[PDB]
Amino acid sequence: NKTVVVTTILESPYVMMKKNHEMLEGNERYEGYCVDLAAEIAKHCGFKYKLTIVGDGKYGARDADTKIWNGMVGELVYGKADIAIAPLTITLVREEVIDFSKPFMSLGISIMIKKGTPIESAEDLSKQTEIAYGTLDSGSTKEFFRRSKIAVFDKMWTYMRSAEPSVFVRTTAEGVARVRKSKGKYAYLLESTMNEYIEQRKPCDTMKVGGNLDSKGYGIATPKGSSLGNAVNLAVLKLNEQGLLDKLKNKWWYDKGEC
Amino acid sequence: NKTVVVTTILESPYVMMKKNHEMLEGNERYEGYCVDLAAEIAKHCGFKYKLTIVGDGKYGARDADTKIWNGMVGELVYGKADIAIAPLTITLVREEVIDFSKPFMSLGISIMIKKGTPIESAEDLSKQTEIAYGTLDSGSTKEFFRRSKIAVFDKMWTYMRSAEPSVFVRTTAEGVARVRKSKGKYAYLLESTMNEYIEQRKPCDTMKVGGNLDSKGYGIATPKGSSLGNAVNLAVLKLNEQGLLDKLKNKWWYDKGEC
Ligand SMILES: N[C@@H](Cn1c2c(c(=O)[nH]c1=O)CCC2)C(=O)O
Ligand SMILES: N[C@@H](Cn1c2c(c(=O)[nH]c1=O)CCC2)C(=O)O
């Protein structure tokens, strides 16, 4: 009945503007894993949709003072969008305010190092300072450390807040560039699937090391109580059971791997 | 207000009767990952509960003719139980009739072989018949092959239905015993976490080989629309974010590993 407003965020390889986007229009201007996923969900559910980019460039958190939700979660909470399709982590605080489909992708926080860096685990990082390490300055990865009550991760958080120069980065691109240019003196903590994607990108100078720090999942989000939630969740399960989600990851991660 | 009726199934290491169960009573007669998980969920949600064992020993499927749901899913569908806490796979057909929490455990179908068996992948199995291979005769693993439209898995299903003697087993214990006694001539297809658990059990003669065939998750189930669903889902997310689910797996899988 009404075109579905999808909120998403520019982040390779999930959503990217095509090289020739200036000659294109509407949803066709974009490409990537989430662009393909959105089309698949829309096809299965039978709805038309419009891809829009989240205004504040955030995933979703609530300001402790104003109690206002930002990011894509906020767009859903305040009715600015009907669905969020992005690498959005399912978390308890977000679950309380919006609906989430079952996971369409599994991941965990992981360590990205420049090849040759003498680090094999989070415990290794926590015990030293010569090799700096940090996370994005917004998002679930940062929140994991900030809220952790596990000794090793809490120590890492205390290290991150007090380390100089700042170990935080504004974007994935910045984090990756920092690892690449720091001669092994910076390790980036990020979600495993992003680590995996970057490991297959030229100059092929990074790698994922150690096991993941946690086990989470990305889910499609809708406003709490939205009648679209049920259908979208069944669509995700259908796509997974058909093997289409695995094919989608292979397409954007490995089929054209550069290493 | 009312004691919550939990339905579960005997399956190591999820639910097992304690060695001294005859001297015990109620929930204390049982031990295992799901017994611990049920206690944790009940603690977080603030409810009292009773562990009961599913009468028909099945997880949950709908008879094509009678349209009746069996297993733990059926107990929920027909109101015989309030919640199912077991290694129950989240699937589309089940999702349509009952509510599921987000996954508390991730897994995928995998291959279990006797050490020394010349098999490294499902494709390897599909191309031959000397080494027989099968699944449980009920459940999601069998259903994966029966419903698959992927060439390799459909070929494997056609092989399973026509292979002699029957390659199907009634229980995990039977499947494991068959692998152990078949001198490398039987490979068992089962959920990865069970494969991992068995690999750390004496006689230490089995091993998990190749990558998983799919990526799924186990979820806590409740009757559709149950007011208990929300709280239970938040409890699962809370336990995961606290690191308790990882600790629980380590406790029942590796802390006392025998290999
Ligand atoms: N998934 C997180 C957002 N996020 C993302 C990446 C990461 O490494 N860390 C992180 O917090 C890469 C893609 C998105 C959220 O939902 O806040
Ligand atoms: N999880 C499946 C049940 N199930 C289980 C195991 C397996 O290897 N295969 C399988 O189908 C081991 C534990 C339970 C379902 O929900 O039907």
Curated annotation (Swiss-Prot), chains A, B:
The record marks R62, R146, K238 as: Interaction with the cone snail toxin Con-ikot-ikot. Coiled coil: none annotated. The record marks I119 as: Crucial to convey clamshell closure to channel opening. Residues 117-259 are extracellular. The modification Phosphoserine is found at S148, S182. Changing N240D: Increases rate of desensitization. Induction: Down-regulated in the pyramidal cell layer of CA1 in the hippocampus by global ischemia. Detected in forebrain. Detected in dendrites of neuronal cells. Expressed in the pyramidal cell layers of CA1 and CA3 and in the granule cell layer of the dentate gyrus. It is found in: Cell membrane; Postsynaptic cell membrane; Postsynaptic density membrane. Disulfide bonds join C204-C259. L-glutamate binds at P87, T89, R94, S140, T141, E191. Palmitoylated. Depalmitoylated upon L-glutamate stimulation. Homotetramer or heterotetramer of pore-forming glutamate receptor subunits. Tetramers may be formed by the dimerization of dimers. May interact with MPP4. Forms a ternary complex with GRIP1 and CSPG4. Interacts with ATAD1 in an ATP-dependent manner. ATAD1-catalyzed ATP hydrolysis disrupts binding to ATAD1 and to GRIP1 and leads to AMPAR complex disassembly. Interacts with GRIP2. Interacts with GRIP1. Interacts with NSF via its C-terminus. Interacts with CACNG2, PICK1 and GRIP2. Interacts with GRIA1 and SYNDIG1. Part of a complex containing GRIA2, NSF and NAPA and/or NAPB. The M4 transmembrane segment mediates tetramerization and is required for cell surface expression. Belongs to the glutamate-gated ion channel (TC 1.A.10.1) family. GRIA2 subfamily. This is Glutamate receptor 2. It comes from Rattus norvegicus. The chain holds residues 413 to 794 of 883 of the full protein.
